[PDB]
Design a protein around this nucleic acid. Structure first.
Ligand code: ADP
Ligand code: BEF
Ligand code: MG
Lengths: 66, 15, 390, 605
DNA sequence: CGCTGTCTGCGAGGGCCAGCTGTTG
DNA sequence: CAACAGCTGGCCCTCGCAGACAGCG
């Protein structure tokens, strides 16, 4: 099949967070259409911007404000 | 004479 | 660089530029070390010489210098193979050059350039000029979108701010020269003047622009004679960087404080000191605004207080390292648009399609184990057409 | 209070600029914050004056910062300074001048010292003062009258309400000067404690005592010195000066033993006089001139055993001229503060290294013991060679994908075990121990989670210490670690983060921690901060590693707990990856091992 | 059959983080 | 209505104390 979207490349640990979001449907939909590799993932282009801030929140949680 | 390891001696950041 | 700019020019404009002798001297000066000798050799010669002879005049050692200089001059089109005689105009014009044919200024240049930077940032007290505003906006480092409202700073505008004054000015002139042709100003006239400065209606407008940036100063109600400043031909630091993400800026100028406030939080203000903290919220904002981490380290590096200079590295490594990590943290997810192909029933043909995708240069990532690959949508039609052809 | 456009406190309309500002290295904002320059020619003189009046907030290697607080000033007058002397010198040092608000503020908190004094005599506490007017003003206060026992004028006050009296006295701007006149106190017999000539106190040690004994009388307060600076010697020297019965309150059974050894090493007091009062044993505390115990033993609230009760009865019915309180920062705890009232002491000397707490009760030490007499600068001592140079680091260990899958989803407080038991983190600890042992370095490993401590201890087959381990057994491990070459690495838990003297411990590693406890971090780094034999000032003799799990809550705590150390100039270099790990035969190299570990962690709950 | 050392529960406490009210613009 | 204090519950670990059980005479 032919699927058009956006490829996301990140560290392996970050990938599990993305899959967890897809399974938990925290975004309201299964943005992941097909996992590519432990290092790369394919997701729907429409929800990339909203997913972008979601990771930023994760970085925000694991970072201290001075 | 027991020099420091590489990671402590020089930056390990990719940049 | 200046030599870079000349190379990116047509032969027609170059020969026109090789006008009065001062230009030929100016272009001659930038010949690195070797070609300067070669220019003198084939200067009194009216008969072309073989290309082999030029090659064998440089010892095998340091041979790479022989080729690079030759390529540079071929780009400058100083000589032609003629089958290597110099340009008859350049030879003649150069021969004319070769026996043929203050403290107030620097302060003025620094201040007038500063007010332009003041205007760049949201400084209410800055020089206002409609021509200057559209110049920066059309220079690719600012955008208004509403003439009534003051313009903002583009992503490249913030980076331009951090660049050192020499490179900050040179980049501006380089953009100015390129847009001079588009607006209808002859590039040769302005470009020739810059060289002559290093030692008509078009110039009058150009001279006014140079006066505005503070490079030149008439001082006599815009007389024919002008007095170029130090910056026109072509400083101690004040920031103390601490291991706890604290910058103490020994600044009296509002511009530098505006610069440092770009990527740090201002805590206290003192006449010869300002306390700023490089919080990840600020730096992430600075990176988001468009700045690049290397510029932030460089901008703090160049304006380093003398006390930190003795220390090596002058910037404590953790601060430099930490800034980079703050930059790299934002781009953990590398978004890349593409089209995925799966259900590769034809396992043998999958490699053939893989090879075809590689040949076209469209493939970005591939997974042989899972028999899948991603191609950018630009090349999606090409691969789709290939699959349809079968 | 004017705020600039860049959220900056504009202080240009408040103060002017001095013409000769280049020589003057001091700034003084109306907020009280004082930014001193460390590269100025006159730094040495300014620092001693400034540290006394203002407690340092951050002291990087270039530009220090201090803050002015009523408690910070109250320490200045006690040592001997006066409002005229402080402000005049402050104005002399100021390169911008002292704003009117701060100038009056300094004056306000200097007309309160000496008005009221607290004197203990014959097992009775009295409120002494030479001015009847101030005493009368105190009597008007309700709680002050409530705690009353039920020319110079003194009214007796019940022991059980000393704390409330002291707290209100500060709130009434009349601090009680709990100053002990030991040299003019013949009622209490003089002990045979004497400083042997072999013991020479270092300049900071002597300077701290100079503030304590500025006058003939002995001052009671909190003396702060970096871990490993030698606070034991200063505490012993204080007893030698007092020459009275001394009570030393350690933190645990390990603390008292080291206190006992230090007294013998640094004093001529005979072994018979030295005694311990701990659950392990007691060296006849009934007969002893110097008593060593722990807050837990004295502060125990439940009914005491007969063996301990007999000693407790003697302790309450005694008069102590000097009560050394090791690890003062634990005093403001709800119950440990009671130990001050339970025991009767004239002068209370407090020794500690990390005068910080995650609550706001650290300020209570001002009246519970006294003003902060001294606070040495860590970098100053580090360059002088008195404390080993440490290259702190933070090894970033990426979280295992199988673990992170569970960590992100799980939120019922089970995360701590999950990212404490990170296989990637384990490998870094395993590799680091192997490499450093090959370099003849004495490794120490800490872990708040005993589960993690046990998991790592057996897997690496290294000794581990924590709660259940008997005092003798844990004492044995330290002696083996101190001397036995075979025992090159030890594992410790929250028990041994404080008071553990391991001079040869060059390397330290931390795989877990209790939240953002700056006190825990600075204390934990202290173990390896002791001066080394063949130490060189600028050679980074010791090292500290705080293993953390990337993209995890431990990152937030790792930054939080580094706040104190960076305030003292320590830079925590980040180690994204460790070279040579791949070519090492480390544990958890297969997903099956990591898969097995994750299930066990989940089972623990 | 007694005495001392080891080990295992009761009860309490320290330190820190997170929470549902109480309060203020 | 939105936003920030604020003391306590909870959790982790630690400690002293008491009780029972095992080794020794
Ligand atoms: N003046 C001194 N001369 C020699 N050794 C000293 C001196 N002061 C301290 N030491 C040593 O430094 C260490 C101090 O340990 P300790 O007193 O427990 O420190 P702290 O209480 O500051 O943590 C010990 O090894 C001690 O012998
Ligand atoms: F500061 Be120490 F370790 F008692
Ligand atoms: Mg100690």
């Amino acid at each position: 099949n032919v699927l058009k979207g956006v490829l996301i490349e990140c560290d392996p640990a970050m990938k599990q967070f993305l899959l967890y979001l897809d399974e938990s449907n925290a975004l309201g939909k299964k943005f992941i259409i097909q996992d590519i590799d432990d290092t790369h993932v394919f997701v729907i282009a429409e929800l990339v911007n909203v997913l972008q801030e979601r990771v930023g929140e994760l970085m925000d949680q694991n970072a201290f404000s001075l | 004479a027991k020099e420091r390891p590489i990671w402590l001696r020089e930056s390990t950041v990719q940049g | 660089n200046l030599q870079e700019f000349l190379g990116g020019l047509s032969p027609g404009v170059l020969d026109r530029l090789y006008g009065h002798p001062a230009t030929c001297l100016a272009v001659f000066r930038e010949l690195p070390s070797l070609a300067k000798n070669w220019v003198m050799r084939m200067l009194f010669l009216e008969q072309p010489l073989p290309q082999a002879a030029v090659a064998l005049w440089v010892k095998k050692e340091f041979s790479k210098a022989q080729e690079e200089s030759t390529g540079l001059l071929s780009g400058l089109r100083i000589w032609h193979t003629q089958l290597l005689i110099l340009n008859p105009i350049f030879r003649q014009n150069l021969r004319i050059a070769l026996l043929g044919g203050v403290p107030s200024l620097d302060k003025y240049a620094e201040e007038r350039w500063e007010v332009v930077l003041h205007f760049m940032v949201g400084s209410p007290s800055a020089a206002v000029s409609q021509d200057l505003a559209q110049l920066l906006s059309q220079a690719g480092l600012m955008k208004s979108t509403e003439p009534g409202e003051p313009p903002c700073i583009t992503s490249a505008g913030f980076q331009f701010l951090l660049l050192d004054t020499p490179a900050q000015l040179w980049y501006f002139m380089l953009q100015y020269l390129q847009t001079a042709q588009s607006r209808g100003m002859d590039l040769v006239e302005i470009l020739s003047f810059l060289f002559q400065l290093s030692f008509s209606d078009s110039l009058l407008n150009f001279l006014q622009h140079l006066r505005e940036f503070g490079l030149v100063f008439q001082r006599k109600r815009k007389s024919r004679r002008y007095y170029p400043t130090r910056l026109a031909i072509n400083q101690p630091g004040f920031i103390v960087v601490e291991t706890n993400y604290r910058l103490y800026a020994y600044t009296e100028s509002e511009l530098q404080i505006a610069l440092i406030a770009l990527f740090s939080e201002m805590l206290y203000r003192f006449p010869n000191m300002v306390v700023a903290q490089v919080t990840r919220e600020s730096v992430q904002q600075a990176i988001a605004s468009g700045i690049t981490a290397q510029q932030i380290i460089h901008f703090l590096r160049t304006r380093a207080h003398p006390v930190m200079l003795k220390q090596t590295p002058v910037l404590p490594p953790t601060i430099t390292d930490q800034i980079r990590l703050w930059e790299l943290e934002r781009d953990r997810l590398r978004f890349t648009e593409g089209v995925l192909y799966n259900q590769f029933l034809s396992q043998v043909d999958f490699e053939l399609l893989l090879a075809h995708a590689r040949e076209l240069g469209v493939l970005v990532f591939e997974n042989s184990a899972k028999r899948l690959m991603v191609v950018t949508p630009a090349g999606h039609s090409d691969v789709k057409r290939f699959w349809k052809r079968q | 209070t004017k705020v600039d456009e860049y959220g900056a406190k504009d202080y240009r309309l408040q103060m002017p600029l001095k013409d000769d500002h280049t020589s003057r290295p001091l700034w003084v904002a109306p907020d009280g914050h004082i930014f001193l320059e460390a590269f100025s020619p006159v730094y040495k003189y300014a620092q001693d004056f400034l540290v006394a009046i203002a407690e340092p907030v951050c002291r990087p290697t270039h530009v220090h910062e201090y803050k002015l607080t009523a408690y910070s000033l109250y320490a200045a007058v006690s040592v001997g300074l006066q409002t005229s002397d402080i402000t005049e010198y402050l104005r002399k040092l100021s390169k911008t001048g002292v704003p009117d608000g701060i100038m009056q503020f300094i004056k306000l908190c200097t007309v309160s010292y000496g008005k009221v004094k607290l004197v203990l005599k014959h097992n009775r506490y009295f409120v002494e003062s030479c001015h009847p007017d101030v005493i009368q003003h105190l009597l008007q206060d309700p709680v002050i009258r409530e705690c009353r026992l039920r020319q110079t004028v003194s009214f007796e006050v019940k022991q059980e309400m000393i704390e409330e009296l002291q707290k209100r006295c500060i709130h009434l701007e009349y601090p009680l000067l709990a100053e002990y006149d030991f040299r003019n106190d013949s009622v209490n017999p003089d002990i045979n404690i004497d400083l042997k000539p072999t013991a020479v106190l270092r300049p900071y040690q002597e300077k701290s005592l100079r503030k304590m004994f500025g006058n003939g009388r002995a001052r009671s307060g909190v003396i702060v010195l970096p871990c490993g600076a030698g606070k034991s010697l200063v505490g012993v020297t204080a007893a030698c000066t007092v020459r009275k019965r001394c009570l030393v309150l350690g933190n645990s059974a390990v603390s008292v033993e080291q206190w006992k050894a230090q007294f013998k090493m640094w004093s001529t007091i005979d072994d018979s006089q030295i005694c311990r009062f701990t659950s392990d044993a007691k060296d006849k505390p009934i007969g002893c001139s110097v008593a060593i115990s722990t807050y837990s033993m004295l502060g125990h609230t439940t009914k005491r055993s007969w063996e301990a009760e007999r000693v407790m009865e003697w302790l309450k019915t005694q008069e102590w001229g000097l009560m050394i309180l090791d690890e003062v920062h634990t005093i403001p705890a709800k119950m440990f503060r009671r130990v001050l009232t339970i025991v009767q002491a004239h002068c209370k000397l407090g020794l500690t290294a990390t005068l910080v707490r995650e609550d706001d009760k650290i300020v209570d030490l001002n009246f519970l013991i006294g003003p902060k007499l001294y606070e040495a600068n860590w970098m100053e001592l580090q360059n002088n060679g008195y404390i080993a140079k440490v290259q702190c680091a933070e090894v970033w260990c990426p979280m295992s994908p199988e673990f992170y899958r569970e960590y992100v989803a799980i939120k019922t407080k089970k995360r701590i075990l999950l990212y404490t038991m990170n296989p990637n983190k384990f490998r870094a600890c395993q590799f680091l121990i192997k490499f450093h042992e090959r370099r003849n370095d004495k490794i120490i490993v800490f872990a708040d989670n005993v589960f993690a401590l046990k998991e790592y201890a057996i897997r690496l087959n290294k000794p581990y210490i924590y709660g259940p381990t008997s005092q003798g057994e844990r004492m044995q491990i330290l002696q083996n670690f101190k001397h036995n070459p075979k025992i090159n690495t030890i594992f410790i838990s929250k028990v041994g983060d404080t008071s553990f003297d391991l001079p040869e411990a060059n390397v330290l590693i931390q795989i877990s921690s209790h939240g953002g406890s700056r006190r825990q971090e600075a204390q934990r780094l202290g173990r390896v901060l002791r001066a080394k034999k063949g130490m060189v000032a600028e050679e980074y003799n010791a090292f500290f590693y705080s293993l953390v799990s990337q993209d995890t809550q431990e990152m937030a705590y790792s930054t939080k707990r580094q706040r104190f150390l960076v305030d003292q100039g320590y830079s925590f270099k980040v180690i994204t990856k460790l070279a040579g790990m791949e070519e090492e035969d480390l544990a958890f190299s297969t997903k099956e091992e990591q898969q097995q570990l994750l299930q066990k962690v989940l089972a623990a709950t």
